[PDB]
Amino acid sequence: TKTKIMGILNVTPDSLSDGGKFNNVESAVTRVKAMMDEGADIIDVGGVSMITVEEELNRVLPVVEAIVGFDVKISVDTFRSEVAEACLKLGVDIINDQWAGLYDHRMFQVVAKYDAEIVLMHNGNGNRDEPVVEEMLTSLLAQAHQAKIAGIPSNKIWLDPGIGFAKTRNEEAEVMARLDELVATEYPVLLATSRKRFTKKMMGYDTTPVERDEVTAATTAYGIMKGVRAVRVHNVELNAKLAKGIDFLKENE
């Protein structure tokens, strides 16, 4: 099958966001249409990183209602089931839980209640009593089973290694060197390395976030060869074209 291209749609300016016309619904719809033309299969709406549930809904719901009708899957970054359920009622397809359901266990029964997909990202404060790869697998496998208990199929339970979260630069290199072990879980893996600090370490020289798109595409091609089923990137066009060629060559084997 095809490697899914998840485009990043930030409603607020961050350090990896490039050109800034943010928090405009008409501009977001124009950007979503541009991402679809560049080859994006999924639109990932940025979310909270201690506001209330009503405040978090006020952040995402204007953009969600305007883009949910398009021919592209909508993914919302939220880890609280009250926010996810209101988004799922509007027709969003994916809930990107950056806590893998550890913050709100009701997330699993809510996502299954709407026959949707969920992304489980490895996160934490950086502390662990075991090596990072074994601790990441142990955490994600347990949370992936919780969604499985709730009734979500395995092909709809996405696993994100969480590059840039709860890991040192050396620990991220250990995870990126052993992506086959996470793909071996038979859950679809979502690689998220776009313009993060790990891609800056791939450069021998200091760089800006935009200057890291080519090495981000390198992680995409490297990830697809390792068996990942989707990538979360800023540059949709560069990765989608590169993913299309790698998908052709990998299935050719």
Residue numbers in the entry: 2 to 50, 57 to 260
Provide the authors' own sentences about this structure as they appear in the paper.
Sulfonamides target the enzyme dihydropteroate synthase (DHPS) that catalyzes a key step in microbial folate biosynthesis, the production of 7,8-dihydropteroate from para-aminobenzoic acid (pABA) and dihydropterin pyrophosphate (DHPP).
In the published SaDHPS wild type structures, Phe17 within loop1 is either distant from the active site locale or missing. In the wild type SaDHPS structures, Glu208 forms a salt bridge with Arg176 and the adjacent Glu179 forms a salt bridge with Arg204. Arg176 and Arg204 also interact via a π-stacking interaction to stabilize this 4-residue cluster. Overall, the data are most consistent for the F17L/E208K double mutant. The kinetics, sulfonamide susceptibility, crystal structures and modeling all present a consistent picture of how these two mutations work in concert to efficiently produce high levels of resistance.
